[PDB]
Write a protein that binds this ligand. Structure first.
Ligand SMILES: CCCCCCP(=O)(O)Oc1ccc2ccccc2c1
Ligand SMILES: CCCCCCP(=O)(O)Oc1ccc2ccccc2c1
Ligand SMILES: [Zn+2]
Ligand SMILES: [Zn+2]
Ligand SMILES: [Zn+2]
Lengths: 318, 326
């Protein structure tokens, strides 16, 4: 133990089950949900939609999701705890920073950012006692100077705790290469890192090189195509990496959410009509699509159960 | 409305406000930051206790009310305001609006949506506290951005629907007040509902008097910032220079347009670490700087006691009093 922190407390890795490693309850901004809950109809309406959505995902086999909403994505761990309890789905909460850090974060040193990430992992988030079980970082283009500080702080928090790092990248710009250079310079093992949004390219050699270095490859936005590139085209990247022998490097998810304020108004209605399966898109469409392309059950179980368990269990490090 | 002002302890009558500092902060931060990382300030309790000591000392020096012009995106925590207002027994008026650091969920909103957010905070309450804003704070860069113009129009519509005043953050060295006033007036807002803030950062009396002559309130609100080289041997600019702008505006006949404040804080995270120690070293009086140093300096220049009382009492009362909506 080696246990994984969830918003309801620690769980053993055998409890994690079928895990979606990149999801959101709500994509927002710090403070926003509590200051303007009517933007989502109400806090109650958002909670009830998320409960129904997680209960839908649970009925399709999901047992754990990783909500990679950070501070600056408006993460509200008390909402996560509520919907987790009512849906009987484990939710792992995140620390780190995404692409919208306020001034009080932008002006911090790497040492200070490290103590904030560590506080959220070791002590708890806000006054809730809920501890993060993953560190989420986002970078753009070439890593900005501040984004490099965040990566180094993330590496340092991970190295003290064994909790893994998952990233937001622009795959069309091959952004994981710069992320990997920085994280390795800190001494972080690639086996502690998921390079996410990696399904947003056709450049397989970029993904294969990262997997061959030990990185987990986050093919985590497949339903976003379903809203030229078909979602089945993105799904075939999973088979491509399987076929090259890197199934133990693959993590798959929807990158879905149940409310969104960090974008144009009503985008949630467009997203939901584009993907009515929500977070069940992965188990209900991608998994059977991979099966009829000849992927065996043992491999799919490895990807959806074994890999997330290894990824999320704190190590220390191989 | 009429003769009642919303505070973090609930409504009070005009007469209760007394000596009022119209531009102050308990904590200069970011949305969510204080609750997510209180040990940045030592602890929430350590920050509350520092604010309470500070407000008590300002109260001993005569202060009865501060206006905390911290917006959502300056990390306003009205629960913290209410706690320290009650412990110090000093009225605190809370703000809505948006400052210079709106997150994505604010940056992508329409004017109609921002108008609703501001109305929510004035008419219903901030977050789930029931505490209603008594002022609308807006900030612009020198030249107003498209989003900042949206914020100004929403602030005007909220002010016109509720009667609560608007107070602004400007770059005085770029005459920021003039672009703001033009946008506000294009929405039909009276200049008498608007304070143009940080106006003591300039020595351009022509800029200050023209705004005053249109009925704007002039926020000479950061006097002690001057109290703490460069390559060109530039020097600082003393706090007495800033304070003499008060006398200048009195001598031009615009006594009734002057608001005076410290723009102080008891914690700050929206700046490089350790700026708070530097500020407290430079101005140990905190928010008491106005009553303990500025008032006697102006008295010493022949300004009558009753003129100083009108500036620090009557002008804020007239400005804060909700004005115009049946
Ligand atoms: C800016 C959208 C708020 C949620 C961002 C979370 P993400 O970095 O994982 O990826 C997303 C997630 C949802 C999106 C919806 C519309 C457009 C782009 C989107 C990108
Ligand atoms: C920029 C972080 C300070 C919070 C904003 C307060 P303000 O914009 O109303 O005026 C001040 C108030 C205090 C300040 C202290 C150091 C640097 C800048 C300052 C600006
Ligand atoms: Zn992302
Ligand atoms: Zn995401
Ligand atoms: Zn300001």
């Amino acid at each position: 133990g080696d246990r994984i922190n969830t918003v309801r407390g620690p769980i053993t890795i055998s409890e994690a089950g079928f895990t979606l490693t990149h999801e959101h309850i709500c994509g927002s901004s710090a403070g926003f949900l509590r200051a303007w809950p009517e933007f989502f109809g109400s806090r109650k309406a958002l909670a009830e939609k998320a409960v129904r959505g997680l209960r839908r995902a649970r009925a399709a086999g999901v047992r754990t999701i990783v909500d990679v909403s950070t501070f600056d994505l408006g993460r509200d761990v008390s909402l996560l705890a509520e919907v987790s309890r009512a849906a009987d789905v484990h939710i792992v909460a995140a620390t780190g920073l995404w692409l919208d850090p306020p001034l009080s974060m932008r002006l911090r040193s790497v040492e200070e950012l490290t103590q904030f990430f560590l506080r959220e992992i070791q002590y708890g988030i806000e006054d809730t006692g809920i501890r993060a079980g993953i560190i989420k970082v986002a970078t753009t283009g070439k890593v900005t100077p501040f984004q490099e500080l965040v990566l180094r702080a993330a590496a340092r928090a991970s190295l003290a705790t064994g909790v893994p790092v998952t990233t937001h990248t622009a795959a069309s710009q091959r952004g994981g290469e710069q992320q990997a250079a920085i994280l390795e310079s800190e001494g972080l093992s690639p086996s502690r890192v998921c390079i996410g949004h990696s399904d947003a390219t056709d450049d397989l050699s970029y993904l294969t090189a990262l997997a061959a270095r030990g990185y987990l490859i986050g093919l985590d936005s497949i339903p976003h195509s379903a809203i030229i590139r078909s979602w089945q085209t993105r799904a075939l990247l999973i088979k491509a990496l399987i076929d090259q022998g890197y199934t133990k490097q693959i993590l798959v998810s929807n990158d879905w959410l149940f409310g969104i304020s960090s974008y144009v108004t009503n985008i949630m209605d467009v997203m939901d009509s584009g993907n009515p399966d929500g977070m069940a898109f992965i188990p209900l469409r991608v998994i059977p699509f991979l099966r009829e392309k000849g992927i065996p059950q043992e491999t799919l179980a490895g990807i959806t159960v074994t890999n997330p368990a290894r990824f999320l269990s704190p190590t220390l490090r191989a």
